[model samples]
Structure formats: C-alpha cells, structure tokens
Target: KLHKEPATLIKAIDGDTVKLMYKGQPMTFRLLLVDTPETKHPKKGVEKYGPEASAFTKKMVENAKKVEVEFDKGQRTDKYGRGLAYIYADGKMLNEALVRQGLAKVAYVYKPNNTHEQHLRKSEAQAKKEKLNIWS
Candidate 1:
C-alpha cells in the first residue's frame, strides 16, 4: 500500500523534524508518532531537553548507512507540507529510537498512518521507567 524509497538526511530542522532528500527530491518531514522537545520554539526559544532530543535525532540519521521511508495514505503531507513517514535507517526505526531513548514523547497521532503506535508507546514506557528526558 506504500512505496518504499531511498531517503537522505539533509539536516536536522529541529528535534521533531528534518530536511530530507527522498527519491532525489528534497523535502521536510515531521517524524510521525513522536514529538521531541522544543528546540525551535517561536517565543520560548530552546526549551529544556530540546537540544538532547535534537542531537539524538541528528545522530541516528547521520549514523545510518541506509535510510528508507514510507508515507501515510491519502493525506500524505501535513499542513506545513512536511511529509509524514516512518523512517528506517541502519535497521533502526528512528521514531522508536527516540522514544526508547526518552528523547521524545508519544504524540500527534495522525490516524491510520500510525502503524507502530503500540510499539512506540511501549518504548515510551521504558523511557518513563528509566526516567529519561521528559520522564525525568
């Protein structure tokens, strides 16, 4: 139901988003099912834990040898035109990795698109158990 394609991390736009090159087209993405700290807050500036979350995301994307993405059906992009997708890079689910590490929180359920919600919530539980980041 979805087309898998190559993706490249162009830059970390913030903790929860990145500029990515997907199938040779440069695009931005709002990492689905995960919301990181506010590194780019409009009025609040950088919020607490923001940098750590941003760093974690950047690290995962930058360290990946192979990155691939698949998007949600129908409404493929958000209001900002940022595509939503599950990113797998170097065998890591970037969204889950952030949750597992407590760099982000379970958030912004965009309906039918959230295929890994259960697993994402489980990761958040572990992060909460360990009192990492927001859980701390």
Candidate 2:
C-alpha cells in the first residue's frame, strides 16, 4: 500500500507538473515515472503533442472529484526541489493515464522511487503499440 496525502488542485502547470494545495500551502509537484512533452519551455518552444498533453492533464485534474499525492521511498524532491510523487485524481493515477494515452513516457526511474515503474511501463507499451501521439 502507498502512503497518500489529500491534496487540492491549485493549477495544472503542464502534463507532468502541477501546483497543489498541500498542508494549506501551494506546492509544486512533479509527476513521478512519467515525462510529458514540454508545453512551456524557453528554448524548446513547445514540443510535438505538448499542447494536447497539457490540455489532457488540465482537464483531468480539474474534473477530478478528489486529489492526492503519493511519495516513493526514495528522495521526495528533484534537483529543482519540486515534490516528486504519484498524483491520484479520483482514485486514478494521473501518471499512468498520461502514459496510457501516449501523452507521456516512463522516465526518471531511480532506486526505490521506481515503485510504480512496472505499471507505468506497461501503460507506455500499450500506447506505443497503438501508435498514439508521441509513439506515432
């Protein structure tokens, strides 16, 4: 079982990131085990499928009845110091949903932080097989 903390959506920054109200304060969280195309980058200037990914994430989070964050056993923060965790919206894991839809890829696997790597990898494979978005 994973340790989950209830959270409130403050903003959906992009496909793989969001600002959530945690412990009565807004905090940025990077979705674990998934990397979505960049929708907001100075140099990258919005990669392919970036807008679609961002839209999907925004809609999903916004429409969810409940939100939560689950941290892995390893480090809780990335180099940028954003909270790294699995985001759950109405009991559905957003990380896997992004991968399943081909909006994101399984990335940044490290140590015990890989608790959901296998599940996410399987979702990626399914999307790849369907030739969806990024896989296309």
Candidate 3:
C-alpha cells in the first residue's frame, strides 16, 4: 500500500502549479480540478491576479510542516505524466482553498467528483460577488 508523508512547499510555479520538497526530493504538483491564470506562457503572459494567486498559494503552502496527498482513480498521470493527487494540509483541502479564495477556477477536466464540487461552486460564487480576480 502507498504511504502518506509530510511535504514542505518550496515555491509557487504559478497560480495552478507548486513545487514542494518531499523526502528530500523536489516534486511538482498541479492543482487538480482548477485552472488559474497563466503567468509563464510566452503568449499568455499573466492573467488577472496571477501574481496574487501565486502569492496566495505560496502563503498557504510554503514551509507547511505537513501535507497529505490522496490518489484518485483514473489515469495516474496527467498529460505531462505528473502524478495527479488531491492534496490536503492541516486537514484542509488545498484545492478547495484556492477556489474559495478565488485564486483559481474550477476545471472539470475529468469525471465529476461532486464530493467538493458544490462547495467549490459556492466559493466561486462568493468570490465573484466580491469581485475577486476574474470577476474584477
């Protein structure tokens, strides 16, 4: 059986990407079910609040003492072959945190996992009502 380990955030690659250190190895994670504004693509440049999103992610994950990743059924790897997982930290869902804070948008790329979709939708609505990020 796979085991869970603590991971420390190293940096934020973008709104949707983060690098972390796990067991002395640097790993990159792409937030599942959410897509944030591009900040590095040559053509895309940076979208609204892209910096804030990155900053926010950094704030939330950087130096985190511990994190837990749960695997989901499907293609184990994304198109780039990076392992896809749902990350949790201090008992909080990192993916949902981004959506709740309006740092990213819900991305239903695969089969519906309604477990947190409803809460995420509500978070997005609140962010929009407050004119956060894209809504602004």
Candidate 4:
C-alpha cells in the first residue's frame, strides 16, 4: 500500500518542482514522471516554453483549493535532495494535468513507485495529437 499526506504547496517552482510542507516539515518535491523546461536558470536564462510551464504550474497548484502528496514506502531521496511524489490539487492529479495540458513531458522513468505512468503516457499521447502548447 502507499502513503498519502495532506501537503501545503508553498510555491510552484516551475512545472516539475514545488516547495511543500508535509506534516509540518518542509519539502522540495519533484513531480515524478514529468520533465518541464527550465524556467529559473540563472545561466541559460529561461528555456523555451518555460514560462508557459511555470504559469501552468502556478495556476494548477498555488491557485488550487488544496494540495496533497502521495508517497511510496521506504523510498530514498534523490541525489539532489528532492523527493519524488505525486501531487494532487483540488483532488486532481497535478502531475497528470501538466502532461495532459502539454506543460510537461513524460521524460523520467523510475521503477516501482511509478504507479501513474500509464495514465501519464496516455495524457502525453493525447497532448501530442492535440498539439497543445509545448507540443506546438
């Protein structure tokens, strides 16, 4: 079984990363199964479509009524100190929404904990067919 927690989204750090507080502890959550354009890079500046992705993330997360996170049991934090998670805002999966809206792509594949990969793939396919934002 998986563990789900009610998390507060403090900030939407672009489309794939978010700062959250879970059970009173702060966390930097990396939205699993998604890869969005770099929006806050100091050197490269903003990548193409990055603003759209960031704006989409802010709208979906910061503006939502509520945000939560689902975590896997016994998972290790990534080398970058980011935890992998599935985010839901207003009872809807924000990760899937990003993919469906073409703000993010299914670019990373991790084992076992990726319970939502099927839905994400389908979303990506539909976004490609529809030629939404990023796909355009």
TM-score of candidate 2 versus the correct structure, residues matched by position: 0.96
lDDT of each: 0.85, 0.93, 0.71, 0.84
Runs of candidate 1 with Cα error greater than 4 angstroms are 1-3
Q: How well does each candidate superpose onto the true structure, as a TM-score? A: 0.91, 0.96, 0.79, 0.90
Query: Model 4: per-residue lDDT, tens digit, 62-90?
Result: 78887878875446467789878888888
Pick the winner on TM-score between candidates 2 and 4.
2
Global Cα lDDT for candidate 4: 0.84
Candidate 1 local lDDT, residue 99: 92
lDDT of 1 by residue, 17-75 (tens): 88998768899998888888887788888988899988888888888898888786647
Give the Å error, residue 78, model 4: 1.2
Error of 2 at 72 (Å): 0.5
User: What does candidate 1 score on TM?
Assistant: 0.91
Q: Roughly what TM-score does model 4 have, to 2 decimal places? A: 0.90
Compared with the true structure, model 3 gives a TM-score of 0.79
Off by over 4 Å in 3: 1-5, 22-25, 112-115
- Each model's number of backbone clashes? 0, 0, 0, 0
Between prediction 2 and prediction 3, the one with superior TM-score is 2
